[PDB]
Automatic annotation (TrEMBL):
Belongs to the protein kinase superfamily. Ser/Thr protein kinase family. CDPK subfamily. It comes from Toxoplasma gondii. The chain holds residues 46 to 313 of 507 of the full protein. This is non-specific serine/threonine protein kinase. It comes from the Eukaryota. The keyword Calcium applies.
Amino acid sequence: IFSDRYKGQRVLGKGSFGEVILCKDKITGQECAVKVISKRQVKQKTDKESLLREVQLLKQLDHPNIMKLYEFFEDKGYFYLVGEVYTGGELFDEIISRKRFSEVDAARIIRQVLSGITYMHKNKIVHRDLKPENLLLESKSKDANIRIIDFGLSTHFESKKMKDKIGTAYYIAPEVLHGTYDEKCDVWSTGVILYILLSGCPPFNGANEYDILKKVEKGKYTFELPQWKKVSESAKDLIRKMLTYVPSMRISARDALDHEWIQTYTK
């Protein structure tokens, strides 16, 4: 059980499928993060054994750009996912706070996000709901790494979130809206993130969730806004390759990570 391994402290905040709380290991004293997925408000999309089968694989997975999952617990009331706690906060909050944000800076971010997606794709894990909220900074350090949270949770878990409805609509893939989605959906979301890091504006706009989803669904976007004239043609080529409507025709995370822009604008 959870009580035999970790002791609960303060509430760090609310996540996707439950509340996050700071917990300490009862033997090593290491501070961890626990996601309390309430069985009453969250439904199980998969069979009890297939959830544990994936969790077992997730525990073995280690990469510098993905949140490390330590252990999983389950009772008659909740579900407990214990992992590495990150102190740097939301990546976008750090970007906004900066004095200057160049193409080199955005490539450093997207190169890190793609490496992370490439690893989970090689290990048959999908995100589906990838957005800025799911991009955390490891620590408050100067050269701190980006960590992707909530990977694989969408596959096994599914409630109402009106205050977070418009937030998810900007980054969602058209196939996900159709119903038939695969791993390609994460490349589209990274495309939206890349588009916003370069221009500051979402490629699919609207005053409400429906208006945003309709634009997402039609799949048409432009490089018409004045901020796109400063942006290199190589970056635009990558966004074009990433926001390809047909998922079959859409380029993979491995090939997206292997682009002229990613290579030249990093190391």
